[PDB]
Design a protein around this ligand. Structure first.
Ligand SMILES: C[C@@]1(F)[C@H](O)[C@@H](COP(=O)(O)O)O[C@H]1n1cnc2c(=O)[nH]c(N)nc21
Ligand SMILES: C[C@@]1(F)[C@H](O)[C@@H](COP(=O)(O)O)O[C@H]1n1cnc2c(=O)[nH]c(N)nc21
Lengths: 195, 193
């Protein structure tokens, strides 16, 4: 169980967490790791059990969740997905920082476990800016843009809760936000680099 | 060597561009996009080799004729295009280069020695494409009519044997996105290693 502390990275989808995470991985090859999640969906060609996912049934996933084996879980497109404590510890055993990129529900689920991650939220400067960035993409209809913005406002309002996040990064500019992210993780990166 | 590029096509606004954006956003270390060449003048903040490769019309025309480009088009009096080298540069990083192009682009890429996976993202019907375009695009009926005629030509061409490796019907974005991931699962496994 010795090794780098996991990082829970959250904030509204589209507000920057994904872009910052890609730069983090690109600039620090061999430092970060993703846990092998469990899923109830059928494996696709080329996917391997124990590497891409632990492919289990709904009955097994529910039994393991009830036993307290998971740090977080959620439903996506008719299938269950989740991160086991063992999968996180497996990344930690490789001297890697396990990145848990989750939504607010995921943050709250992980907060209810005995894991001690660093909690970071990446926020847009405003809901207006998030809306303009999402409108610039053309991935939304007015209705889907509205549903996304309502969920994003709930996330933004909850990000202000005292003690919820260790670091809240306001993404005014990607380079500035990335520098704050690297600074927040500098002590754990240094540990994963020199071991 | 490296992951095969993916050429995503289908009618404009039928889902291909939304799926490409989602693919890139949700994945880490797997997908990449190539840096295009352009003959337009660079603007403030633009950097050669990052935003575009900035070349003259004389050079771009010579290079297109030499077979250096996989696809190209004219826009506002300037040439834009994807070179084979820019795609191979993404492939060299063990990444899947995603190419979002129209039918003409698909046919141009078919004429190169690249071996991409060709995927068409289709609306369930022309009527459903029309209702989706009316909901979003703030357009005139005439402009909607011209777009629907181009879309029907694309839908008819998507049925051509051997043109597309996979034809995904975009009933709903999440369903179409799951099928896109299934179609690329073997190449994603290569990029994940
Ligand atoms: C990260 C995702 F949103 C993915 O985009 C989606 C679908 O994954 P796939 O079936 O592998 O295309 O499933 C979600 N997902 C994939 N793995 C997990 C997980 O461990 N926990 C949670 N809460 N969600 C997970
Ligand atoms: C995608 C665009 F329609 C752009 O919207 C337009 C103008 O680009 P810009 O001058 O940078 O706004 O040029 C087009 N364009 C920009 N790069 C390319 C390209 O590589 N291939 C094709 N076929 N078109 C390209």
């Amino acid at each position: 169980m010795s090794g780098p502390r996991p990082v829970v990275l959250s904030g509204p989808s589209g507000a920057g967490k994904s872009t910052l995470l890609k730069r983090l991985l690109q600039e620090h090859s061999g430092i970060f790791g993703f846990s092998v999640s469990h899923t109830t969906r059928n494996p696709r060609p080329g996917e391997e059990n124990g590497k891409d996912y632990y492919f289990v049934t709904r009955e097994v996933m529910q039994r393991d969740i009830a036993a307290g084996d998971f740090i977080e879980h959620a439903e996506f497109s008719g299938n269950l997905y989740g991160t086991s404590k063992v999968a996180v510890q497996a990344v930690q055993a490789m001297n890697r920082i396990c990145v848990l990129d989750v939504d607010l529900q995921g943050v709250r689920n992980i907060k209810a476990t005995d894991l001690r991650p660093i909690y970071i939220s990446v926020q847009p400067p405003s809901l207006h800016v998030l809306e303009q960035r999402l409108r610039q993409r053309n991935t939304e209809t007015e209705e889907s843009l509205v549903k996304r913005l309502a969920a994003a406002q709930a996330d933004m309002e909850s990000s202000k809760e005292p003690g919820l996040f260790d670091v809240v990064i306001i993404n005014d500019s990607l380079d500035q936000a990335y520098a704050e992210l690297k600074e927040a993780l500098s002590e754990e990166i240094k540990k994963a680099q020199r071991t």
